[PDB]
Amino acid sequence: SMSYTWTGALITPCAAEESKLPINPLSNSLLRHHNMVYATTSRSASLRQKKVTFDRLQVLDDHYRDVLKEMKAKASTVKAKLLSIEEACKLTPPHSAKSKFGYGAKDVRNLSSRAVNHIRSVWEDLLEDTETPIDTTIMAKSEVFCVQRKPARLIVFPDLGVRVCEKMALYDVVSTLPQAVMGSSYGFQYSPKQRVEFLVNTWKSKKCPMGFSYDTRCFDSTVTESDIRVEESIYQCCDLAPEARQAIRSLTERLYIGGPLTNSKGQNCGYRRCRASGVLTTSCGNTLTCYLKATAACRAAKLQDCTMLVNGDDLVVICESAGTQEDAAALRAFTEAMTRYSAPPGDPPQPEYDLELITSCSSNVSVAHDASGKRVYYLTRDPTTPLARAAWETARHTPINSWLGNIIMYAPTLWARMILMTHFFSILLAQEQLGKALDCQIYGACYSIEPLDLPQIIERLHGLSAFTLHSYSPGEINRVASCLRKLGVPPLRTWRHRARSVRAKLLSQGGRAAICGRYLFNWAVRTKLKLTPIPAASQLDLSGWFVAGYSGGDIYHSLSRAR
Numbered sequence: 001s002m003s004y005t006w007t008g009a010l011i012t013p014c015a016a017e018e019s020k021l022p023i024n025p026l027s028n029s030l031l032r033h034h035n036m037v038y039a040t041t042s043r044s045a046s047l048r049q050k051k052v053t054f055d056r057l058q059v060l061d062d063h064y065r066d067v068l069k070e071m072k073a074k075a076s077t078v079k080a081k082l083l084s085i086e087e088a089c090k091l092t093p094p095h096s097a098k099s100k101f102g103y104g105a106k107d108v109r110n111l112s113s114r115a116v117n118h119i120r121s122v123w124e125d126l127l128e129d130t131e132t133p134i135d136t137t138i139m140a141k142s143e144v145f146c147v148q149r150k151p152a153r154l155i156v157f158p159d160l161g162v163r164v165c166e167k168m169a170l171y172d173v174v175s176t177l178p179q180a181v182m183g184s185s186y187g188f189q190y191s192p193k194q195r196v197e198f199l200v201n202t203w204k205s206k207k208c209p210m211g212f213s214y215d216t217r218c219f220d221s222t223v224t225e226s227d228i229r230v231e232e233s234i235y236q237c238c239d240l241a242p243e244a245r246q247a248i249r250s251l252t253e254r255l256y257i258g259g260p261l262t263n264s265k266g267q268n269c270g271y272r273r274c275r276a277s278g279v280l281t282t283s284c285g286n287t288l289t290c291y292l293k294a295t296a297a298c299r300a301a302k303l304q305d306c307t308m309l310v311n312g313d314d315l316v317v318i319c320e321s322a323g324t325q326e327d328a329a330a331l332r333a334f335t336e337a338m339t340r341y342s343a344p345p346g347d348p349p350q351p352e353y354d355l356e357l358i359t360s361c362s363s364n365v366s367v368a369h370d371a372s373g374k375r376v377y378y379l380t381r382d383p384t385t386p387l388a389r390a391a392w393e394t395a396r397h398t399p400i401n402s403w404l405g406n407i408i409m410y411a412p413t414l415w416a417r418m419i420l421m422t423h424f425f426s427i428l429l430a431q432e433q434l435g436k437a438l439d440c441q442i443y444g445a446c447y448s449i450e451p452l453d454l455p456q457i458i459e460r461l462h463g464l465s466a467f468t469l470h471s472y473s474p475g476e477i478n479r480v481a482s483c484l485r486k487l488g489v490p491p492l493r494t495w496r497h498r499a500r501s502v503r504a505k506l507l508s509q510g511g512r513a514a515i516c517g518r519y520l521f522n523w524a525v526r527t528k529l530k531l532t533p534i535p536a537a538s539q540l541d542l543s544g545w546f547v548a549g550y551s552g553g554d555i556y557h558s559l560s561r562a563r
């Protein structure tokens with residue numbers, strides 16, 4: 001069936017759209033080649049529509065059926081709870097898109113009578129009606145990139161009342177079921193330090209390792225109605241409250257498998273028969289589907305002693321080599337099996353014999369040295385997109401601050417320490433905003449974090465070595481330096497000068513600011529300050545941080561204020 005059908009009505013914006021990076025003094029202190037930075041808009045939506053619209057031909061086999069039964073046997077151990085309306089309301093982001101039915105996210109969070117009444121009516125409708133397709137809005141996503149242009153990605157999501165109901169029925173399922181089913185292969189259970197430990201240990205556990213990343217082209221579009229019902233067959237193995245069983249059944253048939261698409265003007269846009277990017281089950285569903293297809297494909301390809309690491313549509317496989325020619329042929333056999341399963345590749349996969357050459361979750365393993373000279377593996381990535389987005393976020397107030405998430409997740413990197421920490425701490429200190437909570441995303445969930453709490457967060461996630469790494473690899477240094485020349489970012493010597501300046505100001509303030517000066521900027525001086533465990537670090541409640549993926553799932557994970 002066709003992933004989409006279109007009526008001809010346009011994918012429309014709801015307000016004015018900015019595509020060019022503004023010429024602003026603060027963003028220009030970070031990145032001078034402003035014309036290289038752009039944001040996608042609804043203007044390129046028709047280009048994306050062409051790419052995502054295609055017929056799917058899916059052929060299942062015994063390997064697929066065998067893996068599915070094994071996955072279902074593991075899912076059968078799960079007991080999932082139905083969330084109360086209050087619990088589901090507290091998981092709604094404060095700036096989540098308002099309902100078309102006269103209430104918004106603030107009303108949901110405050111448990112307003114109108115919001116609660118409407119949520120109750122939507123819930124009852126899911127219990128009573130098993131068939132009426134649920135309306136969804138389609139919008140072009142606004143995302144920032146560096147040139148060499150990508151067309152806008154499309155986001156498809158149901159009304160706020162429906163999203164609250166999805167949490168009630170499925171938040172516990174999507175949070176617990178993936179690790180029960182996939183075990184150590186489930187990527188979202190790991191902090192970046194745990195992910196690098198898993199990759200390194202997996203790589204070293206093979207006699208002669210071979211690894212590869214597998215990129216599916218337009219994954220959400222490749223997801224069939226059969227795949228979405230298969231995913232539901234796994235959810236149904238949970239012990240569930242009867243109302244949750246009915247809501248999952250109704251949501252699968254009315255929303256997850258497909259439905260009508262409406263633009264921002266209220267016009268009928270078309271019909272979807274593939275994964276919606278903006279529902280609670282997107283991450284969990286994509287992860288399970290990718291794992292199922294890939295596990296079965298490994299068996300079809302006769303790949304030996306396979307270990308997979310899956311995060312949504314992102315897949316990395318580490319296995320035992322059978323020799324270069326044999327591995328090349330087995331990888332073609334894997335690709336052929338994935339294609340039959342309706343998961344064809346974007347770029348054909350390449351066998352890799354060096355762990356640092358694999359790019360998975362847009363990241364690669366690299367090595368640096370701690371204060372004692374001991375080798376420390378850590379995850380890095382090309383800094384082009386993080387820097388382009390940090391420049392955008394400096395010039396415009398954006399709902400999500402990717403710079404903050406990048407500092408948290410890539411804290412040990414040369415680029416996050418020398419550039420992002422230096423730039424943002426300098427600006428925030430000049431604005432007396434170091435203590436102001438900002439929103440960022442970790443594994444798709446929204447968190448409200450104060451920049452002053454970064455030292456303890458980083459220590460918990462990455463260890464104290466995140467503040468002591470040095471002797472970065474020549475390859476990593478060259479990649480960063482080349483990216484700075486390309487984007488017109490001042491060189492690392494300028495960043496060291498700026499860091500010494502902000503470090504002195506932070507130390508002079510005492511309190512939490514001085515902890516930031518001591519730990520975050522110890523790299524900038526020869527006269528190192530002693531770094532001991534931060535007391536606040538052991539007291540941090542990081543429950544929920546690295547449990548599951550929630551991209552597109554409208555999840556907020558910071559504490560709710562009592563009423």
Ligand SMILES: Nc1cc(Cn2c(C(=O)O)c(-c3ccc[nH]c3=O)c3cc(Cl)ccc32)ccn1
Nearest residue numbers: 192311314361362379405406409441442443444
């Ligand atoms: N490209 C992907 C990435 C993922 C998993 N993943 C995410 C993620 O965005 O989910 C982040 C991440 C980076 C910055 C801010 N916040 C974050 O969560 C991240 C960082 C490392 Cl080191 C490893 C994996 C990571 C899943 C699917 N496709």
